[PDB]
């Protein structure tokens, strides 16, 4: 990658539905070259894909939660618990962090009941789980994971 | 929205670079109709945009952090602090949650130094801030916020 | 339900021993109609009953406690523990909450000994229980659960 | 009070709409005597009133919260904060407890927004307030404060 | 007991080696009467004994500790653990408290090693023990348990 | 001090109302010598006094509390707060400890009200105080501070 | 040891590569005497050795961590866990402390991965371990354990 | 640096008082070359110095402490507090960490009093300090910061 690729990516991360023309003109380079670089970035895995950004409100996902999960210590209980958490419906993010030395899970649901049935009830039955602490998101001030180039 | 829109969205949330043909054939409907519904979903704000999914590794974003921030109580200190947190470079997510009754901030940086200079040092100077607790993400088991329809 | 029912309920939640006359006159509607609406609200479950409000002081209930209870994780240990907590004498409220992700139990007793014997000693023997934290209420600034319409 | 009064109260705490006849017959005493004792209990403040028990679901009170509030130390800041908490719409219970040495507040709302606007936003502006921690009740296993005689 | 007994006790709690004469004269009552009341207080268990107040410094008890102990929940594990804690050499106080819902243990030793060997090492082996948290007293501002009448 | 003094002290710490005869005979030494050693221990401050051991139950001291107090940092705020805590009626023990790095206060009262009025309300007004956490002692398994020689 | 030895040690703790001449002249004593005292301090174990002070940056040790570890209670689980922690590569310090009543572990690694593989993953498998909390050192303001004489 | 330098450093980190001969023979290289490489490592700052390893016991440093310090947020209060902590006598280590987002301070003293006077009392007066939590090290299982190459 070079400065050029950065400028292309900075644009694609915001709006991928621009035209080579539009982008070529903005970056000041040959359209065929731009098209080449983009194809390259994809082949190399810099660009992994293109997604439709959907507003969760539209889907009535009003019950947003962030849950911390403490794994019971023991052989591979941490690796196992991670993947189990990742496959739960509504869960879009799973991270193992240092400090609390546990898992942080980001999930979304339409309602409390949906949350209870699909997430909570299920997590409280998993073996490797010691404790969980759920924080109800009452306000999303910002959520733009797509912006990786500031 | 109807069941049809859901099927379209379920696909677009995964891969937006499919062709009307490909999607029309998969959903079993007229291409002109599909094209219409998609245009409608956009006009109505269900679909807010299309982004390029970039792998952060490729950008050397290796210092991933999740920080909780306690706001000092007082007139609008909470609303103010939120927006200040959202404008910090590298910060892609800001949430106000219940339980801890504070803010959860998701950010990414290339290094610790970058993290310190851009995020930490800056946050520790903000007035409305009482305390912060940073959790270093040592492993991302999953991060697919784009998947809103399970 | 309509605005009218709300006005009736707002009154009944405060004092149920008023007379149809008194209420009819206050709401400005036919007594037979009022009587009808009240009967309807009961049949529909809006109004579940009428209780005598007894001052706990009069019964010497001076040991008021609020206890948080952490359930040991495992198949249905949460559902089971809930109901066991609800059947303990003196316990009038049981809630499962998010944040602490546990149970909050409201109870009343005449003395510490009564509290120990009936509540504490009993709770500390239950299997599904991991930890409990009891907060001694030293002052009730307000307790009017009956007021549901503000 | 005597054993007799207890039996009367035990009944009235459950259902106050019984008839003297029904109660007299159950307690095995003269109706005029029963009527006397009840009048006495009221005059003495044992029985403070009669309420209609309304199901909160019927009023769409789905956002149930239990909030702990730490008061900033200083002359009468505790007494003041208590009463301010008690006058907030939706708040039906306020207790000062030992252990956490703070306030526990019980409130009900139709939605998160209502909760934010009426409760949270308001509490975060009060001077005497140091910190608050809100626990979202996701399940009421029991709530019968009216039962004071077990 | 009466006001008179209180005055006698208030004195004895401070200095028990006064003479009936000295006390009689101070309380303004017959020496034989005083002697009677004191004998009575003893027979009734108000006064359980007379002790020599020894300065711990003199015995080189420089390692003062206050330890909180969480008992593992289960049948009588709490009652058992209490008595086991009370019989440990150097331990002079054991209390079960509400809030932390555990045991608070007061002990004294000449050195850290003595503390480790006699107290810590021993407590960490007891079955019913879940966790312990030891606070090293670096300063005794006051310790006059003998003063029960202020 | 020598082994002999230890044996004398071990006895006096339990029961100070023994007679030189009784003690002399038990320790196997001349009564005049014993009397000398005891006088010496007093003059040297090993033995600071003799107290009457009074059972707090007899005085209706049923509200036993152990309170942790965090001092606000600043010039001598710690030294000042200590002495203020020590002069509060009912407070018999004050310790500054490491770990929590605060004060532990032992107090006794007849009732909750007495506790509130005399202790709590007063402590919550002191300037140097940041936070307090009160633990209600529901059971004294042991309290024998007088035993310094095990 | 005497004042003289202290002056010698104060110097050697800073720079051990000085010459007897240089030190003799600074301390104002015969070189043969100095040489004698140093040999003595070594034979007596005051001076245990001489080390090369290596800058960790030079070795790319950028992932510095401080981890607290709670041992599960049980026969010798504490002694065992200590030694297991001490033998982990990268771990240079292990302490058992009072307050948290656990272990504090100081370690260094080149990267997060190295940290995970060598330290974290390994610690999370040890039996006697209950919980761990890792604090990522983002800045070493000072690290001079070699200075024992201030 | 190369593999050779590593072998030299691995040795010097353990014992710096070996002779070029001894080291040359062990590493299998010319003494003049070894001498060159060592001089180079010093000039480049890999090797910053040579210290005498002194046993703290010998100096009666029996009061070992590890203190966490929370800085009050505000312009440069963190940078300032760090350096103030580093200049306190007995303090050999100061680290700013993530998780607790504070400072960890390692210090040594002969006694509790020395600890109080030199460290604690002094730290509790510093402005930028919010809270401190001291952990008394009762056992050093290992302390070999000099070993940077495992
Ligand atoms: Mg996207
Ligand atoms: Mg009622
Ligand atoms: Mg005594
Ligand atoms: Mg060294």
Short mmCIF file of C-alpha atoms and ligand atoms in Angstrom, two decimals, chain E residues 13 49-54 145-147, chain F residues 13 49-54 145-147, ligand 3:
data_model
loop_
_atom_site.label_atom_id
_atom_site.label_comp_id
_atom_site.label_asym_id
_atom_site.label_seq_id
_atom_site.Cartn_x
_atom_site.Cartn_y
_atom_site.Cartn_z
CA UNK E 13 -16.04 0.66 83.32
CA UNK E 49 -15.92 -9.62 85.33
CA UNK E 50 -12.90 -7.43 86.04
CA UNK E 51 -9.86 -7.42 83.78
CA UNK E 52 -6.38 -6.00 83.78
CA UNK E 53 -5.98 -3.61 80.85
CA UNK E 54 -2.69 -4.52 79.19
CA UNK E 145 -14.30 -1.38 74.11
CA UNK E 146 -14.60 -1.25 77.91
CA UNK E 147 -16.52 2.04 77.66
CA UNK F 13 -6.06 -10.36 81.67
CA UNK F 49 -5.60 -0.27 84.48
CA UNK F 50 -8.39 -2.54 85.70
CA UNK F 51 -11.87 -2.40 84.23
CA UNK F 52 -15.27 -3.85 84.94
CA UNK F 53 -16.38 -6.00 82.00
CA UNK F 54 -19.95 -4.99 81.25
CA UNK F 145 -9.91 -7.59 73.33
CA UNK F 146 -8.72 -8.03 76.92
CA UNK F 147 -6.95 -11.27 75.96
MG1 LIG I 3 -11.35 -4.71 79.90
#
